[PDB]
Design a protein around this ligand. Structure first.
Ligand SMILES: Cc1cc(OCc2nnc(SC3CCCC3)n2-c2cccnc2)ccc1-c1ccc(S(C)(=O)=O)cc1
Ligand SMILES: Cc1cc(OCc2nnc(SC3CCCC3)n2-c2cccnc2)ccc1-c1ccc(S(C)(=O)=O)cc1
Ligand SMILES: Nc1ncnc2c1ncn2[C@@H]1O[C@H](COP(=O)(O)OP(=O)(O)O)[C@@H](O)[C@H]1O
Ligand SMILES: Nc1ncnc2c1ncn2[C@@H]1O[C@H](COP(=O)(O)OP(=O)(O)O)[C@@H](O)[C@H]1O
Lengths: 576, 575
């Protein structure tokens, strides 16, 4: 049957559910001699196709509890006045086979009322379901798990104490989980040796477990269409050996990925960033300060408690564009192995234009659920720029979105895990309230990368590309007196583009030469340009440009010295 | 059974309910010979999981009244046309066992109609319930108590005279009540000696009684998972001695608190502030004036009545991080009155959302929790949002301030709510706020003095281990014009430096054993056990004055802009 092996994604909420349900189910007799209330209901919510029903079935099988599935529309499709009988009989039958697990798939259909509550019979169904759910006499060990797309879609009374008192957001699987899902979905098709499922997994961003299964099936169907159809040898049952002779090639998977259309790309991603400190070449003072502020409270919470100091839970990065603030935030999140949530400027601008700031509440709740997390508000000054910056609106710096963010931060800190990081290229226009204590008070300045930092940035950008050892990278980094990280990335991309164009043009001509003059003996000399050379980099650097002018760096230096530690205490000595 | 001991939180509305219900129930025969109308219905409302049903059951048990529970959805889940029979039979049965208490849990389901009133059968249920509730012939002593999340959620006709004429807001338990709830929920698990339930209670802000019970259960489950599972010795019934051998450690409670997710952190807090005058080192003139304005009318109301003077019920603090919020908390604490704080973000939210009816709700909540000190922190936020130098084309009037003025004008009836306003920009504050009957008593909070600075440093460093070598008076005197916030920043930076040094040092020392395993283990304890002079010197190296002298000059201008003339200083009566 289905078990933990079938449950893919390694998303680490299956472990939480296990810890939740073993003792109530794995050790049911224990609770008989101990006075404790187990989890009467667990609300699994997330994007559709994430395997919530699969997870519930696997838990039921691995714990031995009698699994009962109450399909939402199955009862809803039944005639009014007798569907209530179906729900009551389902609970009674689950009660009989104690311990039992009752799974309500698509719970947002039985009790969708969000206090709007249209209709008459559906109100009866929701109220009777409430009576049954609250009617659990704590006898036996029936655990009621329900599936819902979002927590707010179901009736709020279902979310109350004793009905569904604890919720788990399965969420979209990540690259590691996408790879494991691909492995589980590719185990009987005799996958080819060339295909590794790693490149596909990385390119598979935005898919869900159902999406991964559909992509694998589409690749298999492409393989079946490409071969074994030309022969057209078919019978009632295709020969096992004949079908096994085919191997799903990388090309088939690539085409399937091109024909994927993932079912929820837009959904926000809660993922441990893969970026590491290696990608950023320097910022040692900044790196150490970030390590302090974030890592120290958790690695050594006892020492923070000993001195009675509450660590700051907000940091605001300020600096010129393209210097690596987003990368620095990702790296700091990676070092602590905490989930990273990034709120770019377009999202804030959308909330501001639409006059919908309640999304800030939802974003903060999501960050709270995925703890430990690093809630990063990238380019937080976007709203101020949108309203102006030199003259702007007649009013002050306060705006709806920033006010909601401040309210959530003030109401935050309770969680002890969410850490707010803010990045802004225009510190002058940022609202001052953002910098007050209890908010993003720790201001960190990210300067233009140094020569060593520039070398590291070039190496990180060119790690994947084949770069000839002849081209000296230290010389190029030193040559770039004030290039930003974005400028270095542009130079590397232009060099790669030049190399790609030259290689394409050359092999194309070489193919004409064989077509025009068919050689008697075929002897390919391989690639005329196998790796990026000095001339490519020289031509690319010919177009190198400094995006960040020295005047805006001067303004940042002004603000930095606008956070000046006075000029009279530098020699402070105690009287002794 | 359940009684007052089970009812935790010490939130002091259980006492009010007791005073409400003893004589109607504890002395039912008394009302037979005396012509008086007892409380026919009591509406208990508050956040879910606050123990309203528990409170009703405890009152019923402790008074001997026959408790009847009419679950909201229990009747609502029944078939239309026969649920009305269930409600009528419930009232008749409660009538038979006089005296009896009928508890309607989740009343917002039987009669949710807020004049929207969707559907047909639910209108019948609400009207029939109204007929029954108003149909109490004052015979027998059935008391109908109902539970609801908010007063406005239920049908307004239920709120009318004779149906539910008096309401009690149980509200979220406070630190003292959170601690007592933890004690009641931790009494049979054999709590460990290291765990005290005091630190957990302080860190437990935002939880409700149900949340506290869930946290305790989660800690117990963590303890059960950590131990007794490794051995894996299990049978049909776990041995009592084996299970008793385990003790819930502080670490388990800490993890549970980390995994709490309290079910209503956002809900407004009505709590007696723990801040005391000790935290503020000075402001003796301000302290005495605040004591006068707030405490004197209540401590000696008779003397206020004798002279026919109505004490001012509004005070506006103006000043540069100087402790206005702390001063308001201290004044509330001295009078032992509930404190409600409305920070600027809330006002800005009401202004941006064009929802000023929340001011009415806030004032009603303050009125219910009397005696209370309704503090409007940073009241000038809306004016700043609209500008301040040029601003909008219109005047200083805005929607939120206008609603606040309307509520204040309609206030004073309660005789208990006291409005305190704090503003860092007195120039832009609306003048109507300062008219008589409003926050007229303007109090200026200046930058802390040397003695005040010493007190602020001591308060900030009370918890942290500070070596006696570091002289605090010298540091306070050295800081010529540091604000309270600046002193707090200096103390926090010193603590951060000490923490980093201690962490780095013990980390190296651990390498030292790992690299060179010593033959005899002899830990020398902590290399930095308390904050020293060098830490404070390095921290003060980064000390900064947040408040410039020009803004202090503007505050001095406004202060002398409330100048008591210049010709009456020598006023003498003719004699
Ligand atoms: C001991 C303590 C821990 C804490 O939390 C620690 C923590 N855990 N997970 C996280 S989050 C995750 C980590 C990486 C990404 C984010 N954190 C955390 C906390 C603050 C800043 N960054 C992380 C808070 C406050 C305290 C205390 C300090 C003084 C006193 S007294 C009365 O003066 O003696 C009482 C209590
Ligand atoms: C006697 C009186 C008491 C009063 O109320 C007293 C009071 N009780 N609780 C509170 S509130 C709580 C206390 C700490 C936090 C808040 N207060 C109160 C009142 C005003 C200001 N602060 C507190 C009002 C007005 C009067 C009177 C004055 C003159 C006349 S005559 C016709 O000229 O002879 C008639 C009536
Ligand atoms: N991590 C996974 N491992 C194996 N199958 C998965 C996984 N995630 C999703 N699926 C696929 O998703 C299909 C249906 O999705 P389902 O489990 O019902 O979730 P939901 O009810 O939210 O749509 C299943 O048949 C299963 O094959
Ligand atoms: N102060 C308290 N003392 C003991 N238990 C409490 C307390 N507050 C809440 N609870 C717990 O809350 C549980 C259910 O909450 P309840 O009393 O029904 O309030 P509500 O109906 O508003 O949700 C109870 O089983 C009880 O254990």
């Amino acid at each position: 049957e289905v078990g933990y092996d079938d449950i893919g994604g390694c998303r680490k909420q299956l472990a939480q559910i296990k810890e939740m349900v073993e003792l109530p189910l794995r050790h049911p007799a224990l609770f008989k001699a101990i006075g404790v209330k187990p989890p009467r209901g667990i609300l699994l919510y997330g994007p559709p196709g994430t395997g919530k029903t699969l997870i519930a079935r696997a838990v039921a099988n691995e714990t031995g509890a009698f699994f009962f599935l109450i399909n939402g529309p199955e009862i809803m499709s039944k005639l009014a006045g007798e569907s209530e009988s179906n729900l009551r009989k389902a609970f009674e039958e689950a009660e009989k086979n104690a311990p039992a697990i009752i799974f309500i798939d698509e719970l947002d259909a039985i009790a969708p009322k969000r206090e709007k509550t249209h209709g008459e019979v559906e109100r009866r169904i929701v109220s009777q379901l409430l009576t049954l759910m609250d009617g659990l006499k704590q006898r036996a060990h029936v655990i009621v798990m329900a599936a819902t797309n979002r927590p707010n879609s179901i009736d709020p009374a279902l979310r109350r104490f004793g009905r569904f008192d604890r919720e788990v957001d399965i969420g979209i699987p990540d690259a590691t989980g996408r790879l494991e899902i691909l492995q589980i979905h590719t185990k009987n098709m005799k996958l080819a040796d060339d295909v590794d499922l790693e490149q596909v997994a990385n390119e598979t961003h935005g898919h869900v477990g159902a999406d991964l299964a559909a992509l694998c099936s589409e690749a298999a169907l492409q393989a079946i269409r490409k071969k074994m159809d030309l022969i057209d040898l078919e019978d009632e049952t295709i020969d096992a050996e004949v079908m096994n002779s085919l191997a799903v090639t990388m090309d088939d998977f690539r085409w399937a990925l091109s024909q994927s259309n993932p079912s929820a790309l837009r959904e926000t991603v809660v993922e441990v960033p893969q970026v590491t400190w290696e990608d950023i070449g320097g910022l040692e003072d900044v790196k150490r300060e970030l390590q302090e502020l974030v890592q120290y409270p958790v690695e050594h919470p006892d020492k923070f408690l000993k001195f009675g100091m509450t660590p700051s839970k907000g940091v605001l990065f300020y600096g010129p564009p393209g210097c690596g603030k987003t990368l620095l935030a990702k790296a700091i999140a990676n070092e602590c192995q905490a989930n990273f949530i990034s709120i770019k400027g377009p999202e804030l601008l959308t909330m501001w234009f639409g006059e919908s700031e309640a999304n800030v509440r939802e974003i903060f709740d999501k960050a709270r659920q995925a703890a430990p997390c690093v809630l990063f508000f990238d380019e937080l000054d976007s709203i101020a720029k949108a309203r102006g910056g030199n003259i702007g609106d007649g009013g002050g710096a306060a705006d709806r979105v920033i006010n909601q963010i401040l309210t959530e931060m003030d109401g935050m800190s309770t969680k002890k895990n969410v850490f707010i990081i803010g990045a802004t290229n225009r510190p002058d226009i940022i609202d001052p309230a953002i910098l007050r204590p209890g908010r993003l008070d720790q201001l960190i300045y990210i300067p233009l990368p140094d020569e060593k930092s520039r070398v590291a940035i070039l190496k990180a950008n060119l790690r994947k590309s084949p770069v000839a050892k002849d081209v000296d990278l230290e010389f190029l980094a030193k040559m770039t007196n004030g290039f930003s990280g974005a400028d270095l990335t542009e130079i590397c991309q232009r060099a790669c583009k030049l190399a790609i164009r030259e290689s394409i043009e050359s092999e194309i001509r070489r193919e004409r030469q064989t077509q025009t003059n068919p050689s008697a003996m075929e002897v390919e000399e391989d690639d005329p340009v196998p790796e990026i050379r000095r001339d490519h980099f020289e031509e690319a650097m010919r177009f190198a440009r400094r995006s960040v002018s020295d005047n805006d760096i001067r303004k940042y230096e002004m603000f930095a010295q606008t956070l000046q530690q006075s000029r009279g205490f530098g020699s402070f000595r105690f009287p002794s």
